[PDB]
Design a binder for this molecule. Structure first.
Ligand SMILES: */C=C\C(=O)N1CC[C@H](n2nc(C#Cc3cc(OC)cc(OC)c3)c3c(N)ncnc32)C1
Length: 298
């Protein structure tokens, strides 16, 4: 039983579901048309995305979808956070309606803009995409730092920051998404003492892996990995290294090598994000400032 939230509730008869968008990165999401959901244009039918439960959904899936919806209300509005548009919570299946990002997730967006002959390169709609420039990659990074700076200031830890969980709109705006694992924290480290092990290992800070704690500085570690993904145009981190072996390698101080499309400056930013001591990593505020400088110079 979900209590009504009138300000977010959207009528079912004004929503028309369409093609599936994929199930691998954000659960079951479908393209849809929502009549009058944009109150600036109240007559118009807007293309939206709708998250819903699969027929094989578990109790945890249901609880996770509700919690995700509530987190989106909590965090509030920002240019680089995927926007909640409404929900159908009464008298039928739970639908959460979010803004449509026509260019997919960041990993697919970057891989589609790789040069031909490179692994994972493909032409969307059998038509070649425009190449990424250096400026575009820095801009991408800047936007995501801004989004995470906002998220952290709302006292939220994401815990699953990765290119697969970033959405890209028609106007190439980066939107942080997938709040399945996100939590509101206080001022002290998030600690459970009970380990569920649902965090993607290759993006996790050592203190998350080993000490079972999470802070904003843990998200900074992940942001470093995201940076590496961006500058490798959607590369898979720790190339050729099994997830299983990374526990040992992190204890021995292993770090990824510099991407070729990366400047020495930006690689040092990555490496700073991967300081073993969390308090020695930059804050999102510092990352934004540094990236602002780099961007306005390029
Ligand atoms: C692994 C690739 C994959 O499955 N997809 C890539 C692009 C497809 N896609 N997913 C979304 C979304 C979403 C969403 C829904 C939420 O409901 C509570 C919450 C979110 O984060 C807080 C994100 C998507 C959108 N929105 N537009 C276009 N394609 C989309 C799936």
């Amino acid at each position: 039983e979900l209590p009504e939230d009138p300000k977010w509730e959207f009528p079912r008869d004004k929503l028309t579901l369409g093609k599936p968008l994929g199930e691998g990165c954000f659960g079951q999401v479908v393209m849809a048309e929502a009549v009058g959901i944009d109150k600036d244009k109240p007559k118009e039918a807007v293309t939206v995305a709708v998250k819903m439960l699969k027929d094989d959904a578990t109790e945890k899936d249901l609880s996770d979808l509700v919690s995700e919806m509530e987190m989106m209300k909590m965090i509030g509005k920002h240019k680089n956070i995927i926007k909640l548009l409404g929900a159908c919570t009464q008298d039928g299946p739970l639908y959460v309606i979010v803004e449509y990002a026509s260019k997919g997730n960041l990993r697919e967006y970057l891989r589609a803009r790789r040069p031909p002959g490179m692994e994972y390169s493909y032409d969307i709609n059998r038509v070649p995409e425009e190449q990424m420039t250096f400026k575009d990659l820095v801009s991408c990074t800047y936007q995501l730092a801004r989004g995470m700076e906002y998220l952290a200031s709302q006292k939220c830890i994401h815990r699953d920051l990765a290119a697969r969980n970033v959405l890209v709109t028609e106007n190439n705006v980066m939107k942080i998404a997938d709040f399945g694992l996100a939590r509101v924290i206080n001022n002290i480290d998030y600690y459970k003492k009970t380990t569920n092990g649902r965090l993607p290992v290759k993006w996790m800070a050592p203190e998350a892996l080993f000490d079972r704690v999470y802070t904003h500085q843990s998200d900074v570690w992940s942001f470093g990995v995201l940076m590496w993904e961006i500058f490798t145009l959607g590369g898979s981190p720790y190339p050729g290294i099994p997830v299983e072996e990374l526990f040992k390698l992190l204890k021995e101080g292993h770090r990824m090598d510099k991407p070729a499309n990366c400047t020495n400056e930006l690689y040092m930013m990555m490496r700073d994000c991967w300081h073993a001591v969390p308090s020695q990593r930059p804050t999102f505020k510092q990352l934004v400032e540094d990236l602002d400088r780099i961007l306005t110079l390029t």
